[PDB]
Amino acid sequence: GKVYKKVELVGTSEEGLEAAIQAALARARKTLRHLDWFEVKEIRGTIGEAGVKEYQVVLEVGFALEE
Amino acid sequence: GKVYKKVELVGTSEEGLEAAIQAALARARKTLRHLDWFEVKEIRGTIGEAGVKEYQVVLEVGFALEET
Amino acid sequence: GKVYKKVELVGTSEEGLEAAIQAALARARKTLRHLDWFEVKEIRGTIGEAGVKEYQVVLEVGFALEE
Amino acid sequence: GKVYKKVELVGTSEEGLEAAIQAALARARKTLRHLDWFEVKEIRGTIGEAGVKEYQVVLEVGFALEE
Amino acid sequence: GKVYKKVELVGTSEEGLEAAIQAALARARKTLRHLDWFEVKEIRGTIGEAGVKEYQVVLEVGFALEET
Amino acid sequence: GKVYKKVELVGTSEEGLEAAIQAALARARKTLRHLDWFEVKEIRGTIGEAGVKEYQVVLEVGFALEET
Amino acid sequence: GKVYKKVELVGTSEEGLEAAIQAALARARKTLRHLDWFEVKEIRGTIGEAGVKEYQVVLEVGFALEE
Amino acid sequence: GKVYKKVELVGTSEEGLEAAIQAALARARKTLRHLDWFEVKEIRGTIGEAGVKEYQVVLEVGFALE
Amino acid sequence: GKVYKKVELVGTSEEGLEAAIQAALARARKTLRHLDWFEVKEIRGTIGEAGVKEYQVVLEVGFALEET
Amino acid sequence: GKVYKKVELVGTSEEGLEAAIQAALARARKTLRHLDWFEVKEIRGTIGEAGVKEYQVVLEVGFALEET
Amino acid sequence: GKVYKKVELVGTSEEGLEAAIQAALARARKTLRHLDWFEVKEIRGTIGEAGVKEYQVVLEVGFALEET
Amino acid sequence: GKVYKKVELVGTSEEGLEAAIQAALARARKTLRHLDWFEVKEIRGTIGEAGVKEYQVVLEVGFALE
């Protein structure tokens, strides 16, 4: 039957975790169709003088391959 | 000594991660007593027109068992 | 080359996940210099009458060792 | 929003892996509604004089909780 | 064929690891039948003035489902 | 020496596990050359009226990269 | 009490997963007694013109030690 | 340099975890020399009327090859 | 809110697992305050003429950080 | 903010582990820009008459996506 | 079809990682035939006055079983 | 009995994995005594024009507490 592909992206944001996830998905939507689900693999980030600099959310994004 | 049970729930929300966790715990409190801690096992979700459609947080919820 | 150290902290907050992460980092910067990155190992928490009582984020914090 | 529960079952069969999975799901269907997805956690089994005696498939079954 | 259910319990005891496991299994047998095997998932515990306060053993318990 | 790429696909089938794997590989062969090995990462699926609706096998597929 | 040993084998078959498992167990029983249980560790395989060339199932086989 | 072998055994005991580990090691020493270290991989067991029937400790045993 | 630190210790004992855990915690309390919980990461050991020589329990110990 | 892509490669070399990693990165830089970091996932290899034939290093490579 | 066996060895060397792997494989080929692949499970070692004393590479070695 | 501490360090080197491990251990020996064993947890690194820029070996270092 149907076949899906999963790609691993890292979304980033200074604002928070949801914003980082949304950034990855917004970029994926620019070029990929039939985006269906995501899976967070890791949460990492950088540190600056005020604490978190960048939140970095590593996620897999699954999409249906067209026929 | 005391014995606990852990149950695996999936909370969902369109709003965010915290809201998804809170939804699972609010449902658990309707029928379970002595809810003590949770552990997030996975964060997953669905995708729609605006990016995230539903955040889905898979968590274990630990509660103390009453004596029989 | 240079050497880094990683320490494991648990930040807590009633407010949310980001707040718990920031609490750990704020404590770290009181005494540690050259804080560079973090890795979330676990998200846990406690439960009370309002649902989540404390969010607890277990993270590794990496920093460069001086000299 | 909606809340799901996951339960861990072990389906067994002398015939094969699919039969073991189907046995677990058939039993779940007797008493649970809104069964949605499954995740295989482990494949194990017993050995007899002719090789595999019983295939044992450990799986999580997710279902939507009714309101 | 036969179907088993696994449940995740946490047994606790001040006395030791075996005692913590036994506490979980004793509670399980008050209400569950055909208990067959267990799997330890984690060993944790709390700390007090004299070292270990409670040993806490997280384990899966498997039991055969009755058939009707 | 040689360099390979691994891509993560999900094959699906109503028929079984082997059929789901085969579906992923048949699709991969339409556009990729030098397909060499696969690794099953997960087995998942959906549930319907007759039990399993779709078997979903998540696998990594390794292929040798051609020189540029 | 009694003691068991576990050995790691890889069964292969062009036919399917069950056949690969059975091939490993058939080889094991030629020389090992008191074969009791198996645990699948990995499912892998090779690819050729027809899709799957060989299914390869990595499993642990547990047996009771005599005496 | 020196090469070690690891084998995976499962010791059992009705009494406890240490006894199960010791049972595996006692059997290993009957036929294997230069036993050096062990690693517990899993703790499992069976259930009976008294609670635990058998503790089953799965462990890797490392020994120096002669 | 409150911040905790985790440190990784290895307790050892010829006597058993509980004794090895207790040895790590006894040493920890000589210098660390507000010790709260532990997590066993690994159980390992050495072998001698009579079987187990030393039990070695690798554990994480969590403690609440004092606020200055 | 900025978005990165990770791809999983397997570099190989008869010479050693570093050479296997370098082979993957050399191939990646022929076609990918803004390569930033890598993560080794597995070390494997093949065996021949004289011991190691090929070292095989499975690694994730992260690169920053260009923005338009 | 064909059946393989995997055995777990630890190669050691003062020189480096490749040398430790090669030591395990050199010993394996003294007694085992049809050695095909290896998988590194762990890299560990001992420490002495000058840093690394022994590199210790824990690996699985797979070989094809002869058919009688 | 005896108690050990483990600390997690990241050694780096442009040259290779062994050199990165040795850098971490050389730094540890400046201030820590009774260094006994290490465990590699991760191998990561950065990429530059020459391929690898820095190898980064994350390792646990175990030492006996005095």
Ligand SMILES: CC(C)(COP(=O)(O)OP(=O)(O)OC[C@H]1O[C@@H](n2cnc3c(N)ncnc32)[C@H](O)[C@@H]1OP(=O)(O)O)[C@@H](O)C(=O)NCCC(=O)NCCS
């Ligand atoms: C169906 C299900 C989701 C409904 O859950 P629920 O909304 O919590 O409703 P329940 O019937 O379980 O109610 C909770 C019960 O636990 C009791 N309870 C609550 N907290 C407790 C505690 N800490 N200690 C002991 N008992 C407690 C409640 O009193 C209530 O018992 P009662 O109805 O006898 O008075 C749940 O029962 C379930 O997941 N069952 C498992 C299904 C399964 O695995 N089936 C096998 C298919 S093969």
Ligand SMILES: CC(C)(COP(=O)(O)OP(=O)(O)OC[C@H]1O[C@@H](n2cnc3c(N)ncnc32)[C@H](O)[C@@H]1OP(=O)(O)O)[C@@H](O)C(=O)NCCC(=O)NCCS
């Ligand atoms: C800052 C840091 C990196 C410096 O490490 P360092 O180079 O070893 O410097 P130290 O001053 O600690 O020297 C090592 C100490 O261990 C002692 N020591 C060395 N070997 C020892 C052994 N085997 N057993 C017991 N003590 C030993 C030394 O004598 C010295 O003791 P002293 O501080 O009482 O003089 C280290 O202290 C650190 O990682 N701190 C963690 C801080 C932290 O996590 N902060 C909380 C943030 S929220």
Ligand SMILES: CC(C)(COP(=O)(O)OP(=O)(O)OC[C@H]1O[C@@H](n2cnc3c(N)ncnc32)[C@H](O)[C@@H]1OP(=O)(O)O)[C@@H](O)C(=O)NCCC(=O)NCCS
């Ligand atoms: C208790 C503890 C949390 C306190 O942390 P702390 O407040 O940061 O104090 P530390 O001395 O450890 O670390 C801070 C020091 O590191 C040094 N330092 C900071 N950043 C550094 C860096 N990048 N490189 C080198 N040194 C650095 C500073 O000199 C500082 O000293 P200061 O507070 O006077 O400015 C910490 O020391 C600890 O985890 N100790 C427990 C150790 C243990 O495991 N005990 C054994 C039990 S069996």
Ligand SMILES: CC(C)(COP(=O)(O)OP(=O)(O)OC[C@H]1O[C@@H](n2cnc3c(N)ncnc32)[C@H](O)[C@@H]1OP(=O)(O)O)[C@@H](O)C(=O)NCCC(=O)NCCS
């Ligand atoms: C004993 C057990 C296996 C029986 O499972 P079961 O046959 O599915 O029966 P349950 O009562 O749990 O669940 C069925 C009930 O859930 C309810 N239900 C079914 N689907 C539901 C859904 N989607 N949402 C909410 N409720 C649902 C129904 O009311 C149903 O009753 P019904 O079958 O008459 O229609 C299961 O309840 C169990 O594993 N219990 C373990 C208890 C335990 O862990 N004890 C602690 C020992 S220390």
Ligand SMILES: CC(C)(COP(=O)(O)OP(=O)(O)OC[C@H]1O[C@@H](n2cnc3c(N)ncnc32)[C@H](O)[C@@H]1OP(=O)(O)O)[C@@H](O)C(=O)NCCC(=O)NCCS
């Ligand atoms: C609350 C809870 C811990 C209480 O467990 P408990 O003390 O074992 O009490 P139960 O009411 O479940 O009794 C055990 C049931 O299992 C049945 N049972 C026992 N062994 C069985 C077996 N081998 N096969 C089938 N059924 C069995 C018993 O007959 C009994 O049902 P009965 O009262 O209808 O005869 C347990 O029911 C539970 O974990 N439910 C959680 C509900 C949940 O997850 N809610 C959703 C929150 S969002």
Ligand SMILES: CC(C)(COP(=O)(O)OP(=O)(O)OC[C@H]1O[C@@H](n2cnc3c(N)ncnc32)[C@H](O)[C@@H]1OP(=O)(O)O)[C@@H](O)C(=O)NCCC(=O)NCCS
């Ligand atoms: C969209 C997608 C699924 C379509 O895959 P596809 O059906 O295989 O189609 P492709 O365009 O990739 O065709 C395969 C290409 O690989 C080449 N190729 C096949 N095997 C090869 C090999 N072994 N070595 C080198 N090149 C090979 C083919 O010649 C073809 O190249 P060409 O069109 O330049 O001639 C796939 O391109 C993809 O998943 N891209 C990644 C998307 C992504 O991650 N986006 C980021 C969002 S933030």
Ligand SMILES: CC(C)(COP(=O)(O)OP(=O)(O)OC[C@H]1O[C@@H](n2cnc3c(N)ncnc32)[C@H](O)[C@@H]1OP(=O)(O)O)[C@@H](O)C(=O)NCCC(=O)NCCS
């Ligand atoms: C059957 C089995 C459990 C019996 O184990 P055992 O009690 O140790 O019996 P053994 O006869 O092998 O005795 C141990 C051997 O190791 C040797 N030995 C002991 N310590 C040694 C050491 N440190 N270094 C090298 N050799 C050593 C002994 O001298 C003896 O050698 P020998 O057979 O040449 O006389 C064991 O052989 C086994 O697990 N076989 C695996 C078979 C298998 O996987 N089959 C494939 C199925 S598809």
Ligand SMILES: CC(C)(COP(=O)(O)OP(=O)(O)OC[C@H]1O[C@@H](n2cnc3c(N)ncnc32)[C@H](O)[C@@H]1OP(=O)(O)O)[C@@H](O)C(=O)NCCC(=O)NCCS
């Ligand atoms: C090569 C190998 C696969 C051959 O396996 P095998 O054909 O089963 O031969 P083994 O002697 O090991 O095991 C079979 C023996 O175990 C014994 N045995 C069988 N079941 C047993 C049980 N339940 N309890 C005790 N002994 C048993 C039998 O006496 C049998 O001898 P037999 O073939 O004459 O009937 C196996 O011996 C092996 O894995 N060797 C490699 C060891 C190694 O790691 N080498 C070091 C490299 S550095």
Ligand SMILES: CC(C)(COP(=O)(O)OP(=O)(O)OC[C@H]1O[C@@H](n2cnc3c(N)ncnc32)[C@H](O)[C@@H]1OP(=O)(O)O)[C@@H](O)C(=O)NCCC(=O)NCCS
């Ligand atoms: C470079 C890269 C990040 C760009 O990703 P991208 O912006 O999404 O562009 P892609 O060409 O890969 O994918 C988009 C194309 O996929 C196709 N596509 C989109 N959705 C699809 C779907 N559901 N099914 C099939 N095709 C689809 C479209 O034709 C699309 O072209 P379009 O955007 O003009 O409409 C991505 O291709 C990549 O990661 N490549 C890595 C290459 C690599 O690993 N090299 C080996 C180094 S050793």
Ligand SMILES: CC(C)(COP(=O)(O)OP(=O)(O)OC[C@H]1O[C@@H](n2cnc3c(N)ncnc32)[C@H](O)[C@@H]1OP(=O)(O)O)[C@@H](O)C(=O)NCCC(=O)NCCS
């Ligand atoms: C086949 C494959 C390995 C070839 O990889 P390749 O040698 O890198 O060649 P590509 O054609 O992908 O070239 C790299 C592309 O990434 C783009 N790119 C490089 N770095 C980039 C960056 N930092 N940001 C955005 N794009 C970038 C390049 O510009 C180029 O696209 P262009 O030719 O349109 O300019 C690779 O495309 C691939 O893995 N696709 C697999 C397809 C797949 O999974 N198919 C589904 C089977 S079911």
Ligand SMILES: CC(C)(COP(=O)(O)OP(=O)(O)OC[C@H]1O[C@@H](n2cnc3c(N)ncnc32)[C@H](O)[C@@H]1OP(=O)(O)O)[C@@H](O)C(=O)NCCC(=O)NCCS
């Ligand atoms: C002790 C041990 C390390 C010695 O390893 P070794 O030096 O390779 O020596 P072995 O005795 O195993 O000899 C290798 C055997 O494999 C056979 N062999 C080699 N390659 C083979 C292949 N590809 N296919 C089939 N057989 C093969 C050899 O011919 C030899 O058989 P033989 O002894 O009947 O002549 C190893 O046998 C072992 O780990 N056994 C321990 C058993 C155990 O776990 N004991 C139980 C303790 S509780």
Ligand SMILES: CC(C)(COP(=O)(O)OP(=O)(O)OC[C@H]1O[C@@H](n2cnc3c(N)ncnc32)[C@H](O)[C@@H]1OP(=O)(O)O)[C@@H](O)C(=O)NCCC(=O)NCCS
């Ligand atoms: C060497 C070491 C094992 C000694 O541990 P120790 O016996 O507990 O002794 P410490 O020097 O850490 O003293 C404990 C400190 O924690 C403080 N403390 C205890 N509990 C505390 C708490 N809950 N909150 C805050 N501080 C606390 C103590 O007051 C003491 O501080 P002080 O030294 O300023 O008086 C430990 O400090 C260590 O592992 N450091 C190694 C650093 C390292 O990694 N070196 C870099 C090598 S590359």
Ligand SMILES: Cc1cc2nc3c(=O)[nH]c(=O)nc-3n(C[C@H](O)[C@H](O)[C@H](O)COP(=O)(O)O)c2cc1C
């Ligand atoms: C990340 C984390 C893990 C914890 N794990 C356990 C546990 O294993 N068992 C337990 O009884 N308490 C556990 N606790 C609770 C603590 O032991 C302690 O009771 C609580 O944090 C209050 O500590 P304080 O009074 O020092 O603030 C955990 C707490 C945190 C922050």
Ligand SMILES: Cc1cc2nc3c(=O)[nH]c(=O)nc-3n(C[C@H](O)[C@H](O)[C@H](O)COP(=O)(O)O)c2cc1C
């Ligand atoms: C489970 C398993 C894992 C394998 N892993 C690798 C690998 O890591 N790298 C590789 O080049 N070949 C790998 N192979 C291929 C084998 O090394 C070998 O080439 C193949 O099984 C043919 O062996 P034979 O000629 O002895 O039958 C693997 C094979 C199996 C069965």
Ligand code: NA
């Ligand atoms: Na040596």
Ligand code: NA
């Ligand atoms: Na001791």
